[PDB]
């Protein structure tokens, strides 16, 4: 976890979006670079680090596993403006992770 938190200390964001596809929970991880650029897979992170001369952090500091309790978790909820990503309180994340483990 220490490893995967380093980028947050450099002003990156980690986001996990959770969807329940008929009882089955699935997560998708994205990073936002400090400039706001959205990165959706390792190759995208490596290119960003290469292109931007970033050497303090590496591919080792990043994971796209939705089962890692690092950064912010969202679940879709309906409302008067339609579906929104709603932030899970840290204490509601665990059951989501646990549902995605095993399998």
Burial tier of 59 (Cβ tally within 10 Å: 0-12, 13-18, 19+): exposed
Work out how close the CB of 70 gets to its own copies at its nearest, in angstroms, rounded to a whole number: 11
Task: Report how far residue 2's alpha carbon sits from residue 49's, in angstroms, rounded to the nearest whole number.
Answer: 20
Comparison of 11 and 43: residue with beta carbon closer to its own copies = 11
Comparison of 15 and 44: residue with beta carbon closer to its own copies = 15
Q: DSSP for 74-103?
A: EEEE--TT--EEEEPPHHHHHHHHHHHS--
Beta bridge partners of 74: 17, 87
Residues that bind its own copies (CB under 8 A): 8-11, 13, 34-36, 74, 77, 79, 81-82, 84-89, 91-92, 95-96
Work out how close the CB of 88 gets to its own copies at its nearest, in angstroms, rounded to a whole number: 7
Work out how close the CB of 64 gets to its own copies at its nearest, in angstroms, rounded to a whole number: 20
Task: Report how far residue 88's alpha carbon sits from residue 17's, in angstroms, rounded to the nearest whole number.
Answer: 10
Comparison of 22 and 79: residue with beta carbon closer to its own copies = 79
Work out how close the CB of 12 gets to its own copies at its nearest, in angstroms, rounded to a whole number: 8
């Amino acid at each position: 976890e220490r490893e995967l938190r380093i980028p947050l200390e450099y002003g990156w964001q980690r986001e996990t979006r959770i969807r329940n596809f008929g009882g089955r929970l699935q997560g998708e991880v994205a990073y936002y670079a400090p400039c706001g650029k959205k990165l959706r897979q390792y190759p995208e992170v490596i290119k960003y680090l290469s292109r931007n001369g970033i050497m303090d952090i590496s591919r080792d500091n990043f994971s796209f596993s939705a089962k890692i309790r690092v950064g912010d978790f969202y679940e879709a909820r309906d409302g008067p403006q339609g579906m929104q990503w709603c932030l899970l309180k840290e204490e509601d994340v665990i059951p989501r992770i646990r549902a995605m483990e095993g399998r």
